[PDB]
């Protein structure tokens, strides 16, 4: 499959392949709302985490085939200022809209734009990378954060380039 690169101007910079495995599936409703009420309220361990693996391809699929599927070469501000990302979001012509945003790693640059997201009603921001310590020697690729109940109740998903890597790398 394929989704337009941007900007934070809003220009056109790529076009990026992503998995048509991940992002282009026909969603299994059944599964996707399955999730959603858990969040709220051997093999089978197995089967269980290919189920959510497929509840997200479900919802990400569902944001890919109705167009509102945003991809950033990136998105990071040097300093929290609630007025940067509205600014960004007009540019992106996403300033009437619900959107969420979902950003790779717990760095200063994404840590910014997340802070910049609280006074926005309608933005939500999710920094999908959730190590706690650093996890000894070897720390998993992860998406923990990313969930179907935001992808569906926020109208657009805003993801970056290498957010879109990492989703494919947990669940393609």
């Known amino acids: 499959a394929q989704v337009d690169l941007l900007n934070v101007k809003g220009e056109k910079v790529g076009t990026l392949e992503i998995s048509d495995f991940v992002?282009?599936?026909?969603?299994?409703?059944?599964?996707?709302?399955?999730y959603v009420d858990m969040q709220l309220?051997?093999?089978?361990?197995?089967?269980?985490?290919?189920?959510?693996?497929?509840?997200?391809?479900?919802?990400?699929?569902?944001?890919?085939?109705?167009?509102?599927?945003?991809?950033?070469?990136?998105?990071?501000?040097?300093?929290?200022?609630?007025?940067?990302?509205?600014?960004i979001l007009q540019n992106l012509q996403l300033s009437d809209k619900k959107t969420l945003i979902v950003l790779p790693w717990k760095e200063e640059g994404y840590m910014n734009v997340k802070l910049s997201g609280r006074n926005l009603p309608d933005v939500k921001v999710i920094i999908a990378d959730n190590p706690n310590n650093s996890k000894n020697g070897e720390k998993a690729v992860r998406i923990d954060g990313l969930n179907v109940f935001d992808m569906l109740k926020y109208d657009y998903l805003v993801l970056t380039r290498d957010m879109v890597s990492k989703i494919e790398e947990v669940l393609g």
């Not at 599936?25 to 996707?32: C, F, G, L, S, T």
């Not at 693996?53 to 998105?75: G, H, I, P, Q, T």
């Open 23 to 34: 992002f282009n599936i026909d969603p299994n409703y059944d599964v996707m709302w399955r």
């Open 41 to 87: 309220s051997d093999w089978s361990k197995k089967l269980n985490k290919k189920m959510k693996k497929l509840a997200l391809r479900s919802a990400l699929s569902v944001k890919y085939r109705e167009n509102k599927l945003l991809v950033l070469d990136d998105l990071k501000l040097e300093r929290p200022k609630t007025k940067s990302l509205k600014e």
